[PDB]
């Protein structure tokens, strides 16, 4: 699968295993970024042990079960297959900074939007991803592949596999989400999205003219998640927890809001430490 | 006079469709008007927001006013996304609600009939469910809601009436009967109470 | 646990054409159903007419520029959008004219009443004033020289309210209209008075029908068939809207 100027391939052999390689041919400079590096995709082995219904034909069509290798709107490689989890390359610019982050969990998201059943009749055929916008046909039935009247590419949002079943079955059967973990997951999503956008900001330049504004809004949400986690830690009367979480705050106004949270959530001792952090940020 | 007789105190169904067509809907564009970093005429409309129209990206869902979504769907330049309530699962849920509570209407959106008709006529190929089944469930909902209305028009007093959750087209078609029978039962009462 | 929505709102507390069109549609919907002649929104209509004039000029200029890529969708959308806006204003104005024709003598007696709390200058537009005056005058001339010329002076008045039957037509104040309880126009509920919270937690208004001496709770987000006279006060405050 190739983007405008860069080519991404996955090499498999019975002796070397699944090895990917991201090479950017370029207009006049064949700048390499990876070569035969190991990849964390799970090849279908247990599911291929003569226990499957209607999946045998598809597995015959594609032995490795990798559905697509589509890029992102910013050149981030993505992988989809039997495990039904996206695999992004966060810091793909530096070979030493290689990072394989599972950004979406198709089965978990489907379950949490299906009402509670672990439905298997819903299969995801991804097409492309662009900044939380995963376009994928959701075929309903026993056939994994779609038909000639290709359905509308319904969009799914990226979600980390931080959703714990033990926490999610609090209301055993609009699936309820633990607010304690929901804000943390939003924090993780904002973090990874900001990191991805910063890579293309200085290097690839502006793309649509609104990357700076969406990055600023994302950073605002990033600090809002930190503020919520700070309040949650203060709810447990753990001053050290809130102090540790307060060192990652970006906007100073969010730090003032953290000062207010400390001074209101029955934690007089946190007031002095958050004020000390703010006073240190005065000179930083 | 200036306003015809059949338009005196009611809305013609064409005017109801006109009112419904001003509501925003979500579409998947088949074009891309987002100007790149590296001319072109912008919409700059005066009765809606042009921001979501000058920033369309192909196969990236936005929200535009319905009468513009239909205009683009006249060509192959968009794809109207059916609202969540217009699926077989939700229609079955609403039908079950209607069959379970025989005293009150279900919580369908006020434009459900008009929107269903418009989408079935102009966007017949954008439904994840077979349209031959969506039509059969829309008709079933209409029949149940008509049965409940005829059994409540049996409570046409002279004080007031609470037609909770009733749609807009149903209200529009029942207006000339309810609002002209209650007027007569009020005139009789006020004539009696002339003391 | 304690709620932290207050600080979240605190950190977020650092006339538009869409609103003008929405107000125009609300006024049109209210005018089509209300038995009385609702007050004219002079400022909104002035802004709307200015917008139509400027947009027509803009479309003409863009067409001249095009008369020398080939993106014609924006121009088609501009044209059809302007057509829709013009239709809404057309229907609104013509409904008002029909109501003026129906209640010409009532409006006349309101004008001639020094004890009246309303004035046609504050309730009719300038073109409506001119149309009402001219139509009343010409119909008066026709009825005079066709019927009233051959009638004595005691039976020659065109607004004889002392006869066997009143001959000035008044709007049906107790007419039944379909109302949807919007609630306060702003998004805040406790600020607005008259909103006596009902049981089950749903806020509601409270209006009394003098004829029946009955109190009815107007729950927010509900549809009612109420007498227009009872609703008139709330409707003037936009707390309810005629369906």
Curated annotation (Swiss-Prot), chain A:
Keyword annotations: DNA replication, Nucleus, Phosphoprotein, Repeat, WD repeat
Signal peptide residue numbers: none
Annotated GO MF terms: chromatin binding; identical protein binding
Any one Gene Ontology BP term: mitotic cell cycle
Subcellular location per the Swiss-Prot or TrEMBL entry: Nucleus
WD repeat positions: 81-121
Gene Ontology terms: cellular component: Cul8-RING ubiquitin ligase complex; nuclear chromosome; nuclear replication fork; nucleus
Function comment: Accessory factor for DNA replication. It plays a role in accurately duplicating the genome in vivo.
Note, other: Present with 3280 molecules/cell in log phase SD medium.
Name the record gives this protein: DNA polymerase alpha-binding protein
Organism whose genome encodes this protein: Saccharomyces cerevisiae (strain ATCC 204508 / S288c) (Baker's yeast)
Swiss-Prot record, chain B:
SUPFAM superfamilies associated with the record: GINS helical bundle-like, PriA/YqbF domain
A GO BP annotation: double-strand break repair via break-induced replication
Keywords: DNA replication, Nucleus
One GO cellular component, as annotated: nucleus
InterPro entries, per the entry: GINS_A (IPR021151), GINS_bundle-like_dom_sf (IPR036224), GINS_Psf2 (IPR007257), PSF2_N (IPR056784)
Major site of localization recorded for this protein: nucleus
Family according to the record: Belongs to the GINS2/PSF2 family.
UniProt protein name: DNA replication complex GINS protein PSF2
Organism: Saccharomyces cerevisiae (strain ATCC 204508 / S288c) (Baker's yeast)
Gene assigned in the entry: PSF2
UniProtKB/Swiss-Prot annotation, chain C:
Keyword Nuclease: no
Function summary: Required for DNA replication. Functions as part of the GINS complex which plays an essential role in the initiation of DNA replication by binding to DNA replication origins and facilitating the assembly of the DNA replication machinery.
InterPro entries in UniProt: GINS_A, GINS_bundle-like_dom_sf, GINS_Sld5, SLD5_C, Sld5_GINS_A
Cell location: Nucleus
Name of the protein in question: DNA replication complex GINS protein SLD5
Assembly, per entry: Component of the GINS complex which is a heterotetramer composed of SLD5, PSF1, PSF2 and PSF3. Interacts with PSF2.
Gene3D superfamilies in the cross-refs: 1.20.58.1030, 3.40.5.60
A GO cellular component entry from the record: DNA replication preinitiation complex
Family classification: Belongs to the GINS4/SLD5 family.
Gene: SLD5
Keyword field: DNA replication, Nucleus
GO biological process assignments: DNA-templated DNA replication; double-strand break repair via break-induced replication
């Amino acid at each position: 699968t190739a983007q405008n100027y860069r080519v991404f391939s996955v090499h498999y052999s019975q002796f070397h295993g699944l090895s990917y390689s991201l090479s950017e041919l370029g207009t006049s400079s064949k700048r390499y970024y990876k070569r035969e590096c190991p990849l964390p995709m799970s090849l279908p082995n247990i599911n291929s042990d003569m226990k499957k219904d209607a999946n045998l034909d598809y597995y015959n069509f594609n032995p490795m079960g990798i559905k697509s290798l589509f890029f992102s709107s910013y050149g981030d490689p993505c992988i989809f297959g039997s495990d039904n989890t996206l695999l992004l390359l966060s810091k793909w610019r530096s070979p030493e900074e290689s990072k394989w982050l599972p950004i979406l969990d198709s089965n978990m998201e489907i379950w949490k939007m299906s009402g509670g059943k672990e439905t298997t009749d819903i299969h995801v055929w991804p097409l492309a991803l662009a900044y939380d916008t995963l376009n994928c046909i959701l075929v309903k039935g026993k056939h994994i592949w779609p038909e000639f009247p290709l359905p509308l590419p319904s969009e799914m949002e990226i979600r980390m596999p931080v959703f714990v079943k033990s926490k999610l079955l609090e209301e055993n059967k609009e699936i309820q989400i633990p607010v304690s973990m929901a804000a943390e997951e939003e924090y993780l999503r904002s973090k990874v999205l900001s990191e991805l956008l910063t890579d293309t900001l200085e290097n690839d330049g502006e793309m649509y003219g609104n990357e700076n504004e969406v990055l600023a809004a994302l950073n605002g949400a990033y600090d809002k998640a930190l503020l919520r986690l700070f309040a949650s830690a203060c709810s447990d009367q753990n001053v050290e927890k809130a102090l540790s979480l307060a060192h990652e705050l970006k906007q100073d106004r969010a730090l003032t809001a953290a000062v207010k949270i400390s001074e209101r959530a029955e934690l007089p001792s946190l007031v002095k430490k958050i004020n000390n952090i703010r006073e240190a940020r005065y000179e930083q | 006079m200036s306003l015809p007789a059949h338009l005196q105190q009611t809305f013609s169904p064409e005017e109801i469709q006109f009112i419904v067509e001003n509501e925003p809907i979500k579409i998947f564009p088949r074009i891309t008007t987002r100007q790149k970093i590296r001319n072109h005429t912008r919409w700059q409309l005066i009765t809606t927001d042009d921001k979501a129209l000058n920033n369309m990206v192909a196969m990236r869902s936005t929200e535009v006013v319905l009468w513009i979504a239909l205009l683009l769907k006249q060509q192959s330049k968009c794809s109207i996304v059916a609202p969540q309530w217009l699926t077989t699962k939700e229609l079955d849920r609403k039908i079950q609600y209607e069959k379970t509570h025989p005293d009150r209407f279900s919580e369908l959106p006020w434009n459900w009939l008009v929107l269903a008709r418009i989408l079935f006529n102009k966007a017949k190929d954008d439904f994840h469910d077979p349209i031959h089944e969506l039509r059969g469930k829309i008709q079933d909902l209409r029949e149940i809601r008509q049965i409940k209305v005829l059994k409540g028009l049996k409570y046409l007093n002279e004080s007031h009436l609470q037609l909770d959750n009733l749609s807009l087209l149903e209200i529009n078609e029942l207006r000339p009967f309810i609002t002209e029978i209650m007027d007569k039962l009020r005139e009789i009462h006020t004539a009696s109470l002339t003391a | 646990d304690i709620n932290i929505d207050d600080i979240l709102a605190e950190l977020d507390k650092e006339v538009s054409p869409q609103q003008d069109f929405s107000d125009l549609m609300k006024s049109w919907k209210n005018e089509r159903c209300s038995p009385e002649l609702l007050p004219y929104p002079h400022q909104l209509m002035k802004r709307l007419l200015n917008r139509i004039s400027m947009q027509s000029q803009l479309i003409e200029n863009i067409s001249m520029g095009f008369l020398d890529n080939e993106s014609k969708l924006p121009l088609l959308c501009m044209e059809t959008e302007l057509e829709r806006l013009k239709f809404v204003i057309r229907s609104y104005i013509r409904c008002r004219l029909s109501k003026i024709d129906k209640f010409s003598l009532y409006l006349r007696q309101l004008n001639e009443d020094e004890n009246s709390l309303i004035s046609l200058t504050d309730l009719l537009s300038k073109d409506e004033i001119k149309y009402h005056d001219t139509h009343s005058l010409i119909w008066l001339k026709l009825v005079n020289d066709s019927i009233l010329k051959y009638m004595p002076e005691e039976l020659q008045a065109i607004n004889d309210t002392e006869g066997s039957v009143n001959m000035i037509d008044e709007p049906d104040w107790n007419k039944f209209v379909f109302i949807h309880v919007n609630g306060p126009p702003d998004g805040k509920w406790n600020e607005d008075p008259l909103l006596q919270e009902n049981e089950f937690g749903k806020p509601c208004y409270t209006v009394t029908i003098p004829d029946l001496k009955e109190e009815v709770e107007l729950t927010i987000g509900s549809i009612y068939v109420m007498r227009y006279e009872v609703i008139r006060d709330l409707l003037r405050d936009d707390k309810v809207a005629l369906i």
